[PDB]
Enzyme design. Structure first.
Site, PDB file in Angstrom:
ATOM      1  N   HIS A 169      -7.490  43.589  -6.253  1.00  0.00           N
ATOM      2  CA  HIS A 169      -7.933  44.615  -7.180  1.00  0.00           C
ATOM      3  C   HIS A 169      -9.090  44.181  -8.048  1.00  0.00           C
ATOM      4  O   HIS A 169      -9.357  42.997  -8.227  1.00  0.00           O
ATOM      5  CB  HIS A 169      -6.802  45.059  -8.120  1.00  0.00           C
ATOM      6  CG  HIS A 169      -5.435  44.992  -7.510  1.00  0.00           C
ATOM      7  ND1 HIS A 169      -4.587  43.925  -7.708  1.00  0.00           N
ATOM      8  CD2 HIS A 169      -4.776  45.854  -6.701  1.00  0.00           C
ATOM      9  CE1 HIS A 169      -3.459  44.135  -7.056  1.00  0.00           C
ATOM     10  NE2 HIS A 169      -3.548  45.298  -6.437  1.00  0.00           N
ATOM     11  N   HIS A 189      -9.957  44.039 -11.837  1.00  0.00           N
ATOM     12  CA  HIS A 189      -9.426  44.115 -13.192  1.00  0.00           C
ATOM     13  C   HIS A 189     -10.496  44.603 -14.162  1.00  0.00           C
ATOM     14  O   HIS A 189     -11.659  44.751 -13.785  1.00  0.00           O
ATOM     15  CB  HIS A 189      -8.837  42.762 -13.580  1.00  0.00           C
ATOM     16  CG  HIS A 189      -7.516  42.518 -12.927  1.00  0.00           C
ATOM     17  ND1 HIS A 189      -6.376  42.179 -13.631  1.00  0.00           N
ATOM     18  CD2 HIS A 189      -7.128  42.683 -11.640  1.00  0.00           C
ATOM     19  CE1 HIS A 189      -5.356  42.105 -12.798  1.00  0.00           C
ATOM     20  NE2 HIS A 189      -5.787  42.395 -11.584  1.00  0.00           N
ATOM     21  N   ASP A 228      -7.728  49.670  -7.738  1.00  0.00           N
ATOM     22  CA  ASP A 228      -6.696  49.567  -6.701  1.00  0.00           C
ATOM     23  C   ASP A 228      -7.211  49.556  -5.274  1.00  0.00           C
ATOM     24  O   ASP A 228      -7.335  50.609  -4.646  1.00  0.00           O
ATOM     25  CB  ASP A 228      -5.640  50.671  -6.851  1.00  0.00           C
ATOM     26  CG  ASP A 228      -4.647  50.381  -7.944  1.00  0.00           C
ATOM     27  OD1 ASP A 228      -3.935  51.316  -8.377  1.00  0.00           O
ATOM     28  OD2 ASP A 228      -4.589  49.209  -8.381  1.00  0.00           O
TER      29      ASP A 228
HETATM   30 CU   LIG Z   1      -4.859  42.539  -9.368  1.00  0.00          CU
HETATM   31 ZN   LIG Z   2      -3.538  48.905 -10.110  1.00  0.00          ZN
END
Ligand SMILES: [Cu+2]
Ligand SMILES: [Zn+2]
Ligand SMILES: [Cu+2]
Ligand SMILES: [Zn+2]
Lengths: 153, 151
Positions: A46, A48, A83
């Site tokens: 992902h 951040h 995501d």
């Molecule tokens: Cu992550």
């Molecule tokens: Zn997430």
């Protein structure tokens, strides 16, 4: 828009370069590259919120969440912008990444530049975990290695 | 795009954290650096946020307007040109700057780029040769980090 790069470094073995291309401007980003040192199987992946490495991968904060929704997989409407779901390591612990996402961006607003990309200790359950953690991090676990997503050529 | 920070890391002893605040106004750049050799040290922004081959892959100084290298106050300078930070006797540079020639949100967005600190002094361009036209004879890249959005 176009071309980014992120060297993922950590405190253990896992390391890898991830390139990002975005041909058009408001559309899809091809994410690709290679990460080593991982255990075979699935690993959370992902962006951040913060390109902050002061206190290591911890400082990156939560998943990039510009719309402040719940954690999900890349195909679910209810997802985080960061995501990207999972990447997959073969044996040799090598994960040749190849992703195409049309939520994350190199341009603006959803722009993930100067942000942190994380690969995780465990599989991301894509929100389907059935606990509260699954709605935050998809239960992906520790942060094995991370880097700030910076401009390339 | 109001706060930023960069962990200057290098494959040597030189290392430190640098912060950035903005409120299309000026940018305060502060933090410390350690492991330096006493004196003046070249310090500023390069074009690419690419640590792939170390500091090298950051490339040339961030220069949006195709110009000669310079000190922060020369009219002719690379947008990324910060000139010098001073490492006290203890190799510890206390950094504070309010450059308005750089920003965290512009066509001069320093975000996603690599902050670099150098072997020697930024010639501020008055070095009397070709090299000081590009780099200010600042020498090798002792440490760098990608500039990234801070909380
Ligand atoms: Cu992550
Ligand atoms: Zn997430
Ligand atoms: Cu430099
Ligand atoms: Zn310069």
């Amino acid at each position: 828009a176009t071309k980014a790069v992120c060297v993922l470094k950590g405190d253990g073995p896992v390391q890898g370069i991830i390139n990002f291309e975005q041909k058009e401007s408001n559309g899809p980003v091809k994410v690709w590259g290679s990460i080593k040192g991982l255990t075979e199987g699935l690993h959370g992946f992902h962006v951040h919120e913060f390109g902050d490495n002061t206190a290591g991968c911890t400082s990156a904060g939560p998943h990039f969440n510009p719309l402040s929704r719940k954690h999900g997989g890349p195909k679910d409407e209810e997802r985080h912008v960061g995501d990207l779901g999972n990447v997959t390591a073969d044996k040799d612990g090598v994960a040749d990444v190849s992703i195409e996402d049309s939520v994350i961006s190199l341009s603006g607003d959803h722009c993930i530049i100067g942000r942190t990309l994380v690969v995780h200790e465990k599989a991301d359950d894509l929100g389907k975990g059935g606990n509260e953690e699954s709605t935050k991090t998809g239960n992906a676990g520790s942060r094995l290695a991370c880097g700030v997503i910076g401009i390339a050529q």
